[PDB]
Design a binder for this molecule. Structure first.
Ligand SMILES: [Zn+2]
Lengths: 328, 328
């Protein structure tokens, strides 16, 4: 057994990556793992530039580094080549460009109603990603820290939506099922305005399609699961691994956090039992994900705050920590 | 603060109850709480008879008591007046009666297709409950241990389904929208067979409606939530409490299991941190569910097995355990 090494060295070594996602439902020290990895990845390659991108509304990355971040990418104090921002002049571009994506959103809703059986995903989920691409210096790799709750695959289901947006585009320009005429009547727009709107938006729909196709490429993009030795935490990563499989997303790495370093030899009786409780859930992962890199991160007394402790935490991601149940 | 007592004494005292449910997603020692409470409730009222009913497919109650159980209710060795069974001669009744509920299931599917917009819940979920009522000696109270995963409110959404079954019944006998004629043609049945089938089944649909209305009565039925001090465990009981609210189900009691009895004074550093981690999640419950009885059950070294330990565990459900952070 233990075919795969319990380390994130393969991912740190492989410099071909551009997008590294970090997903994990609940409080599993995900933002610690997301932050610490970015630091480690930055100081190991001091020549190349890197981005840390959080979709967490609680701004847990700013508390991890002990430094506030905004929508604009800001250099991390003490770690150059590492920039951090918070997702969810340029306001003048937003008004003019937002008008078209307003008009598009109107055109797809109208066009959908003539075919789509009471169904329409918003263009905001796509428009949000189209804004994100505009602010991507030239960073060697971008590290994604997904939301801890709600819908955490918001950017990873775009290729499903574009396919329907491009379906509408073909049906309009071919005038299939008399959709072009029905849209021209309802919205009161000219054929030049409709073909005009398709022309201006399509290029930005194409870069999304192509960038979303890079996520499906395992040499360009990888996903790292984060969890804890607890029943519900397993169940959530079971679904996540199955959800990335149907999306053609690569996941071969999982980080178990808050692992209690204790066994039968531990004098503390209360620790011996909590270790037995964890062993049951850590084994399941080993048996189930035998083709994954399963990284075990020890329990720390104080929660990780500052570049100093992030760097210290990061040691156990690449150099596997020697627990008591480790033979050597 | 602490308006409500951290005990299940109100529920043990109130003998007016007939149905006590125990719900809790994941491994939160739910079957320990379900078992131990039944034992405590049985030995406090030695005159009256009680039932312990598990819908868990893993048969975790049989391992808790250390005694196998079947579909038939079996007396617990050392605790008379307490019977335990596993849900999910009499086979001769099942064939003859199953034919009608086969015919009904056929009639509702057929009738639904003429109105219900591609929608039909199965009659098996109801038929399963109709079988359960037949085996309800005269037990003073029945203690329900719901499934730990999947759909754990299977019996508690029957009043939604019967309303539609009774909707079909009215529409048929009134011949509204020409449904009676359409059913008589498709299934090739006589008006006497349809009105004949309604007549034989309705009484059993009525006892379900009335028994399901007793669940909504807070003096006859109550729900007890079970969870652990962990992020995902909270989130799951948040949904459960909100789901029981829309169903008009009474829940004013929650049992937090595997509570580590440690604080700043605890010599063990590894225990001090795991106590700080738990404090964050235990407080949320106190702030949020200020109108609920929040019971704190201490962490035990060995998992509960046998009537001896169930009885010992049950002490801390009624007499609140003195933790270190308890002033006295
Ligand atoms: Zn300890």
């Amino acid at each position: 057994a233990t075919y795969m090494l319990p380390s994130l060295h393969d991912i740190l070594d492989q410099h071909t990556y551009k997008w590294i996602f970090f997903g994990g439902k609940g409080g599993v020290g995900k933002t610690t793992t997301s932050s610490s990895f970015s630091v480690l990845m930055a100081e190991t390659r001091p020549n190349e530039k890197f981005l840390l991108l959080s979709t967490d509304p609680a701004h847990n990355i700013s508390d991890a580094f002990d430094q506030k971040f905004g929508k604009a990418p800001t250099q991390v104090s003490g770690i150059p080549n590492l920039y951090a921002m918070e997702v969810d002049d340029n306001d003048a571009e937003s008004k003019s460009e937002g008008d078209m994506f307003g008009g598009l959103n109107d055109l797809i809703t109208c066009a959908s109603s003539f075919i789509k059986d009471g169904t329409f995903p918003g263009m905001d989920e796509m428009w949000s990603f189209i804004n994100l691409i505009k602010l991507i210096n030239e960073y060697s790799t971008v590290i994604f820290d997904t939301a801890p709750t709600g819908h955490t695959l918001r950017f990873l289901e775009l290729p499903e939506t574009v396919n329907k947006v491009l379906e509408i585009f073909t049906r309009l320009k071919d005038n299939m099922g008399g959709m072009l005429s029905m849209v021209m009547q309802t919205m009161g727009l000219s054929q030049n305005d409709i073909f005009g709107l398709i022309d201006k938006t399509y290029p930005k729909i194409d870069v999304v399609k192509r960038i979303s196709a890079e996520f499906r490429d395992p040499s360009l993009c990888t996903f790292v699961g984060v969890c804890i030795p607890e029943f519900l935490s397993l169940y959530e990563t079971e679904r996540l691994v199955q959800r990335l499989a149907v999306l053609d997303m690569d996941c071969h790495a999982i980080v178990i956090n808050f692992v209690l370093d204790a066994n039968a030899a531990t004098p503390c009786s209360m620790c011996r039992s909590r270790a037995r409780m964890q062993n049951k859930y850590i084994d399941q992962i080993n048996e189930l994900y035998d083709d994954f890199n399963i990284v075990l991160s020890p329990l720390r007394h104080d929660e990780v705050r500052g570049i100093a402790n992030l760097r210290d935490y990061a040691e156990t991601l690449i150099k596997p920590y020697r627990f008591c149940w480790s033979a050597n």
